[PDB]
Amino acid sequence: SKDFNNSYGISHITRDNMVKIPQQQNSDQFKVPAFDESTIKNIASAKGKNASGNTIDLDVWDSWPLQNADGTVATYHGYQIVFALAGDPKDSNDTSVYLFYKKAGDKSIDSWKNAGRVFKDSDKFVPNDPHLKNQTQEWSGSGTLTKDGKVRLFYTDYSGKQYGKQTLTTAQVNMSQPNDNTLKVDGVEDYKSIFDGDGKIYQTVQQFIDEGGYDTGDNHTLRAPHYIEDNGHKYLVFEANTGTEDGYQGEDSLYNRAYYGGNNPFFQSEKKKLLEGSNKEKASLANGALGIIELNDDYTLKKVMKPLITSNTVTDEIERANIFKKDGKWYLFTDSRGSKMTIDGIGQDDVYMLGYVSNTLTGKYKPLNDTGLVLHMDLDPNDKTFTYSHFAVPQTKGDNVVITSYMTNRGFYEDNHSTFAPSFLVNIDGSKTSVVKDRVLEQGQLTV
Ligand SMILES: [Ca+2]
Ligand SMILES: [Mg+2]
Ligand SMILES: [Mg+2]
């Protein structure tokens, strides 16, 4: 193995940037705001029935608003809509997409109503599809309001029985209004798998199985599809991992200057450190990516594209892919936990949102705030005001985005269930971002 430099024509989250985060993160510029613990409520309408027909107060975690094509929050027949994962706090494998809704003008968490699950259990068996019949959980995605006024959902088909296989999936959700304050899910159609990896550009579950599966410490991902449009084309941007031809995992990746950045002396010392320490194996296996595919207008796969950015050597897990245009530029964001990173000074409690900017959709992504740090949340997982899945929601006017997240870990408290965190504001200006210090919003608030 010899030193080399191959970018594979894509951008990279680099070690030289990540190593600076520990000394940079303890600043009001990046810190997720301290939240008012005493006033946090559960989502009162987050109730579901189980197989025995008993009503349960649900945990409600990763959530996403129904968006216009440009990323702004849609208004659907006078409502804002939020899709969210939810289930029984007592069953960590009970995960379904629910549809919540609130009158556009209303603001309080109490004004969020629950239209119930998007899918019936029987729905997955209806279409002629190679994957849906194997689904065991419904994981996160995105939602777009089409120009024809249709509710178009993207989510992740997770299959515990197929070694944690994850498939980008879509459906149209048919809605009606039986009265003035109710939205009803009538059913779904055009329900189908879109993409489950190819092997060369993005890792497949089969690659995961063949290398030896869970015992290996590899973490296979293919999830959180986020819909965008760019000048007549439609895309999904999603969490994945590289395939064999765009810089795969492997001991050889540790010799690729592209993943280190900085200059030769840093690359030599950091490489040596990696090879001699207990991060070697995890760094080798680390090949996270924010992938992109183009879709046809019927939401089928049109083209598998090279990733926008990767985290080779740094982590296998860059989550909650998010991307939108602001000021003529494309901003790209991802959530990532320090516990899965291989960076000195980043620890078990550290959770981040990282951000990058490009002049074009597939162009070079450069880090925001020099290192790529946007948000830092380090509260212990037991903290009631622990937040996760931070998501930047672009706005119609101004330079602020709204950050949504879920609050309180799943199943951690008898009375305090995973719920909508109070939303907050981040300023975006060129390659700089800053948390807006003197404002907090309602729990689950999407727009200002
Ligand atoms: Ca990997
Ligand atoms: Mg504060
Ligand atoms: Mg396939």
Q: Cα separation of 407 and 405, whole Å?
A: 7
Q: Which two tokens stand for residue 167?
A: 């498939």
Where in 18-150 does DSSP place strands (E)? Answer: 47-49, 55-57, 59-67, 79-87, 96-103, 113-117, 137-145
Resolution of the PDB structure in angstroms: 1.9
Q: Which residues pair with 351 in a beta bridge?
A: 337, 377
CA nearest to 140, candidates 124, 123, 118 = 118
CA of 243 to the centre of ligand 1 (A): 9
Report residues near ion ligand 3: CB below 5 Å. Answer: 196
Rounded alpha-carbon distances, angstroms, from residue 189 to 44, 152, 186, 273, 297: 29, 10, 10, 53, 15
Q: Tell me how far the alpha carbon of residue 19 lies from the centroid of ligand 1, in angstroms.
A: 21
Phi, psi of 191 (to 5 degrees): -95, 120
Contact 72, 395 (CB under 8 A): yes
User: Which ligand has the shortest distance to the CA of 435?
Assistant: 2
| Among candidate residues 310, 261, 255, the one with its CA nearest the CA of residue 288 | 310
Strands (E), 148-217: 151-159, 165-179, 182-195
Whether residue 70 contacts residue 85, with contact meaning beta carbons closer than 8 Å, is answered with no
**Contact status, residue 341 vs residue 348, Cβ threshold 8 Å:** no
Q: Which DSSP helix (H) or strand (E) runs through 275? A: helix 264-276
Which two structure tokens, joined as six digits, stand for 6?
């191959």
Buried b (16+ CB within 10 A) or exposed e, 320-343: bbbbbebeeebbbbbbbbbebbbb
Secondary structure class of 131 (helix, strand, coil):
coil
Tokens of 426: 């981040």
DSSP calls for 86-118:
EE-TT-TT--EEEEEEEETT--SGGG-EEEEES
- Cα 237 to the chain's mean position, in Å? 10
Mark residue 385 as left, alpha or beta (left: phi above 0; alpha: psi -120 to 50; beta: remaining): alpha
Q: Which residue, chain included where needed, has tokens 């008898």?
A: 414
Separation of CA 301 and ligand 3 centre (Å): 10
User: How many Å apart are CA 309 and CA 137, to the nearest integer?
Assistant: 27
Task: Compute CA distances 31 → 85, 352, 392, 436, whole Å.
Answer: 26, 9, 15, 10
Ligand with smallest separation from the Cα of 310: 1
Tokens of 95: 């995960």
List the CATH number of the domain containing 412: 2.115.10.20
N-terminal to C-terminal alpha carbon distance within the chain? 53
Residue 355 Cα, ligand 3 centroid: separation in angstroms? Answer: 29
CA distance 11 to 332: 11
Q: Is 258 helix (H, G, I), strand (E, B) or coil?
A: helix
What approach was used to elucidate this structure? X-ray
Q: 377 - beta bridge partners? A: 351
Per-residue b/e over 69-80, b at no fewer than 16 CB within 10 Å? eebbbbebeebb
Sequence-separated (6 or more) residues with CB below 8 Å from residue 407 = 35, 40, 384, 385, 386, 387, 418, 419, 420, 421, 422, 443
Sign of torsion over alpha carbons 122, 123, 125, 131: negative
| Domains contained in the chain, number | 1
What the block records as the tokens of 334 is 């991802």
Distance from the alpha carbon of residue 13 to the mean position of ligand 1, in angstroms: 15
What is the SS3 string spanning 162-179?
Answer: HCCEEEEEEEEEEEEEEE
Q: Mind telling me the catalytic residues?
A: 62, 319
Q: Which domain holds residue 40?
A: 1-444
As a whole number of angstroms, the distance between CA 357 and CA 160 comes to: 35
The first and second tokens of residue 190, run together, are 């055009």
Q: Which residues are within 5 Å of ligand 1 (an ion), measured at CB?
A: 218, 241, 249, 285, 287, 316
Could you please report the per-residue DSSP string of 239-264? Answer: EEEB-TTS--SSGGGGGBGGGT-S-H
How much distance in Å is there from the Cα of 375 to the middle of ligand 3?
34
Assign 3-state DSSP to the chain and report helix, strand, coil percentages, each to 5.
15, 40, 45
